[PDB]
Amino acid sequence: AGSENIRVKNIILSNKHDVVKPAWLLECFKTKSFVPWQPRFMIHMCPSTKEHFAREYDCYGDSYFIDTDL
């Protein structure tokens, strides 16, 4: 959901699903590959995904193992 409407807010209230910005599909189409998620695209995190990205990524978009660009 690219617009945080009432449905998006209701899904946010429940912690059983993950929201991703529509740019993820466009990026997949351009690369024609199943690229994994990034904190920039997603606006919400499930507890499992939150734990998964906590190890790989930091409290913000910055990560540890993968370098960063401008």
Binding site: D62, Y64, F65, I66, D67, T68, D69, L70
Partner: protein, 201 residues
């Protein structure tokens, strides 16, 4: 203390100009002293508050309006469209000025001046006043020009410095970002090395 010198064309002999100097303390309302000259002989007269008030009352005019009209006529305050005609009967020593209004003339003021025995003194005083005022004006103009030149130079310098600063702003921003990414990549390498060592252990 103020004084104004003006040029006039007497209708009796409208070929040679005359010069009239009128001096007042604060405003023409209280009074003033007038002196007419032509380069050979001069006449002088004075107008007081009582005389001007009586003349205005005879005119059935507001004091402010009469004072303004007198200032316009005597201080060379010519308006966009207005002609004033002056004439001085020498035999009767009577000088009066009127406001010509396109074939209807309205006499504005009239006085009786006394022929001063010594015209040389008044001419010399007028010349001295003119020289003093021109010297003062020249000094003021020189000072103002110097100040303007200095201010223009300072403004040019400040504008150049501002251009340099705005140009360097982007360079500073990009240098800061580059340094940021350098140190961040160093920290990423450090964390990667620590993770690899932990995995090996």
């Amino acid at each position: 203390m103020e004084r104004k010198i003006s040029r006039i064309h007497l209708v009796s002999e409208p070929s040679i100009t005359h010069f009239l100097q009128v001096s007042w303390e604060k405003t023409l309302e209280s009074g003033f002293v007038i002196t007419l000259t032509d380069g050979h002989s001069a006449w002088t007269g004075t107008v007081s508050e009582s005389e001007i008030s009586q003349e205005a009352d005879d005119m059935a005019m507001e004091k402010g309006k009469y004072v303004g009209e007198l200032r316009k006529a005597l201080l060379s305050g010519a308006g966009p469209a207005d002609v004033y005609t002056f004439n001085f009967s020498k035999e009767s020593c009577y000088f009066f000025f009127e406001k010509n209004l396109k074939d209807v003339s309205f006499r504005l003021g009239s006085f009786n001046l006394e022929k001063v025995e010594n015209p040389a003194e008044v001419i010399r005083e007028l010349i001295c006043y003119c020289l003093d005022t021109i010297a003062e004006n020249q000094a003021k103009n020189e000072h103002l020009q110097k100040e303007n030149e200095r201010l223009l130079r300072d403004w040019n310098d400040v504008q150049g410095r501002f251009e340099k600063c705005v140009s360097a702003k982007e360079a500073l921003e990009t240098d800061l970002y580059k340094r940021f990414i350098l140190v961040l990549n160093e920290k990423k390498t450090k964390i990667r090395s620590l993770h690899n060592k932990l995995l090996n252990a």
